[PDB]
Amino acid sequence: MDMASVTKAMAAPESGLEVRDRMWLKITIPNAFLGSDVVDWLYHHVEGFPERREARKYASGLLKAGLIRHTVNKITFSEQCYYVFGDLSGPQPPPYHELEFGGSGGSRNELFLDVLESVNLLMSPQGQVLSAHVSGRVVMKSYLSGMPECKFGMNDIAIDDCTFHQCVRLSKFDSERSISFIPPDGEFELMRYRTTKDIILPFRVIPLVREVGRTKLEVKVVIKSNFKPSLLAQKIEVRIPTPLNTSGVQVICMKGKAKYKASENAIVWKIKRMAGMKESQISAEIELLPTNDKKKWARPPISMNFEVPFAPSGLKVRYLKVFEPKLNYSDHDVIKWVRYIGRSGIYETRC
């Protein structure tokens, strides 16, 4: 078989080879294994080897091959030192520097993690959630020098299905709650996913519409923010659909502002931002012209758009270890920035 495929074998988290985070000096090497266990698993599970003296000659081949990188700069293949995988899957710009007072600040090495989810709901008049699911994706801007091996980890959250950027090693997710990989430079979609269980619904809408004769139609809708009081959801928009026979509409709201764009047959309520665990109300009286043969219909659900600074799925980033074998830097030298941006898609409540 080919060398690449062989290593890829040890790769599977279930394979024989033990691979765990080891700690040397102050540093902490991510997903590393002993050079011995490699020669072991090499012959024990890899056939075509006469003696263990041949299983080691091969291992030395993988080191020169690159499929296996030396934790700390060393040319000869030792067996009593740790190792980390290379690029098992299928350009040098000038670096930055810390600004000093006439001085050479250490090279720049930071990364950005963006968790972008979109919540979609279809709640019933009384709260009975009907539709519900979150479509998310984790994007990453990499500004790391060389080819540092990284280990991304989060909580575990019943994730449904998902894809992963090629550079992602074969990482079990039900037991690891962490995947490994060699980050391509620049920005890329580390992974994608979609969940439906245990989703956090930012807002809850309590719609109340009453009929008073024909000309009168009362409306009182209240929204309840649902999340830590410390977090503020901004760019909020509520869309309440008015009948077609609308003659005149009067609105009242203590917070934000709300207009009645008839050109769209709906009242638009815009709220600068709103804290957690809080309620807000908007009420309005709708005038109706006697309905002389109106189209066939039922009240379009009340849509809602927003943006909350957290992961509507419950996903939270626990850590992103970075380690460069060739160069000297370890996590301690890397600046890590995260940011959750949960937006809203089809978020409607049955009128």
257 marked ligand binding residue: yes
- CA atoms of 90 and 1, how far apart (whole Å): 17
For residues 344 and 202, the answer to whether their CB atoms sit within 8 Å is yes
Question: Is 270 among the annotated ligand-binding positions?
Answer: yes
Measured CA distances, 232 to 224, 225, 273, 317, 343 (Å): 13, 9, 6, 20, 13
CB atoms within 10 A of CB 131: 12
Residue length of the chain: 351
Query: Whole-angstrom Cα distance, residue 200 to residue 313?
Result: 6
Q: What three-state secondary structure class fits 234?
A: strand
Retrieve residue 103's tokens. Answer: 């001085």
Report H helices in the chain: 3-11, 35-44, 52-65
State the sign of the Cα–Cα–Cα–Cα dihedral 74, 76, 82, 88: positive
Q: How many other CB atoms are found less than 10 A from the CB of residue 117?
A: 26
264: helix, coil or strand?
A: helix
Break-preceding residues in the chain (C–N over 2.5 Å):
90, 156
Residue 151 known to bind ligand: no
Residues making up the binding site: 257, 261, 270
